Amino acid sequence: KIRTLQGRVVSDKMEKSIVVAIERFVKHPIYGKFIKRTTKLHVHDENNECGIGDVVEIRECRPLSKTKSWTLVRVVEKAV
Amino acid sequence: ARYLGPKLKLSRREGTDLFLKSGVRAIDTKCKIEQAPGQHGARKPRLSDYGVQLREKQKVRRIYGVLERQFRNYYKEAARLKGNTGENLLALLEGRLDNVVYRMGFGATRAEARQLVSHKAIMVNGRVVNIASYQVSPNDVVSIREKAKKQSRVKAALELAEQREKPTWLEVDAGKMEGTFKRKPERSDLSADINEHLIVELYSK
Amino acid sequence: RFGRIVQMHANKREEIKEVRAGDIAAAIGLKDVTTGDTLCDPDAPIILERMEFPEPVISIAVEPKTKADQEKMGLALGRLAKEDPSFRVW
């Protein structure tokens, strides 16, 4: 297939853009305990679709903005 | 950097003879061995464990005159290879040129032996070599230069060394000095008064 | 050696690559040369032309402003020790 992430929608107080958060359960280098290492990405999407709290397939693309360089594929798990 | 000092004084510091001044007087009479290395060597110490490791390290050193910097290289080399480091240390040390010169009987003492080797009078395997720390590789041969042959040092080495035990893993021509060296030196084919775990324990730290 | 050769028009430097007989030039480098030295051609016959050494006359003394300049005092006057024949240091 192609490189695509899972993420979670965080900051949608703006237009045609979203800051997603993707969780990384990495292993600590020296202490061996798994830490919930967060990662936040300015991700471009199409016209204002979703809200907060929904897992969102997102793939790498052109640098559409200064920071936004990823594209939202689809919205999964709509909730309250 | 060789040793260049009074010779049997090391043997009286080690008690026994390490065959360092064999020569014509093949009996150690004018030596007063064991109880007089110095003005106060007429007594005995409690001789701690560090000392008994060091004095044993000194004996294996003094038969072949290996300086510590050169000596430590063998321990780095023996532990590098396979097998036992106690066995490998002496095995690679037996391959020294003056050691095989002595084991084949071309020299009656190692100082007399190395004087032949350093003055490039030995054509080992087809090439004259003047550096005594040359590894005499397994399954080989060693010849002597004919144009510097038999100047009364070789014949006296031929006389005395044929009275002394006739070594095992090699063959002496005994007519015109054509030494052949065949196999790997085994732990059982040794002087056996030396120990080995005294050395490799000291060199761990 | 012979590093660089200069014709020396009153402490002005023009480069000389070859010197003939009878000309004056300055040889730059020359670590151990003294006054009136007979520089000859080696791997060849060696010549000599030097016989004179003039007189010293009045000896005075000195002491610098501090002792931190005393290493330069022996050096800079030692720098002057190489130059003049009739100028000694005690």
């Binding site: - | - | 501090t66 002792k67 931190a68 005393q70 290493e71």
Partner: protein, 62 residues
Amino acid sequence: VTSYIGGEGHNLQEHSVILIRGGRVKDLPGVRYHTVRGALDCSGVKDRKQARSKYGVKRPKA
């Protein structure tokens, strides 16, 4: 800082460019260095024919 003057009979004075190497002089409180004799204006010791690598005495002529 302070420093210790090893040996005996030093020709030191009010100003002398000397050289300093570190080392605790434990019996002296608050002195942490040793002047190396064999250096600059702090000259060598006399009658120190033994252990002369420290104190900078040369080998006697023979």
